[PDB]
Design a protein around this ligand. Sequence first.
Ligand code: BNG
Ligand code: BNG
Ligand code: 26G
Length: 176
Amino acid sequence: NVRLLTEIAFMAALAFIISLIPNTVYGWIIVEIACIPILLLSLRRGLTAGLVGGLIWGILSMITGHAYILSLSQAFLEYLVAPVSLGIAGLFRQKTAPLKLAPVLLGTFVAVLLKYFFHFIAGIIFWSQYAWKGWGAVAYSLAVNGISGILTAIAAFVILIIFVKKFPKLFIHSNY
Ligand SMILES: CCCCCCCCCO[C@@H]1O[C@H](CO)[C@@H](O)[C@H](O)[C@H]1O
Ligand SMILES: CCCCCCCCCO[C@@H]1O[C@H](CO)[C@@H](O)[C@H](O)[C@H]1O
Ligand SMILES: Cc1ncc(Cc2cccc(CCO)c2)c(N)n1
């Protein structure tokens, strides 16, 4: 209630704080560990809570000057649509015990995939001026964003697996 709103705000604040950590692997290839609090929020509280947490994270990135903004339409795609889209993991919420790892991992996979699909589309339209010598716009965006998405999923997998084994109730909301 009040509690749902606090959880959302705190996880979005957490994602933003985490996003301040340097995460560059090479060029524009990143490991986006900042997705994890939004993933966890979504898995615990469902689609709407996740969408809104993603929204708040994106707005925070932009208004603090930490987003890479090339245009209104690009920033809309990459810092509203993209982070919001992590909320899709919410469709994999488990409401009842025992907690299973399967929906956690499938939901993480589908949500990181969806986010980076939007970054991949953005990459084609707005970032092709950076494409490695000899690479076309699509192939360059596929490699940058394909690799970033996989790496981000790897990291999300590692952390959430630990969280499932050690703190499975992070994932299951209860009153009481
Ligand atoms: C519906 C649009 C709302 C417009 C205002 C944008 C930010 C909304 C919440 O702001 C704050 O973000 C801080 C980040 O650290 C948190 O510490 C704090 O808990 C939270 O309250
Ligand atoms: C790129 C967009 C991806 C679309 C995502 C489709 C989400 C469908 C989620 O299904 C749910 O999965 C749960 C756990 O696996 C099942 O317990 C439950 O029966 C089922 O309702
Ligand atoms: C080729 C290419 N280069 C840069 C970007 C911009 C970008 C990529 C992934 C994630 C973010 C947001 C969090 O930082 C931004 C892009 N989409 N495609």
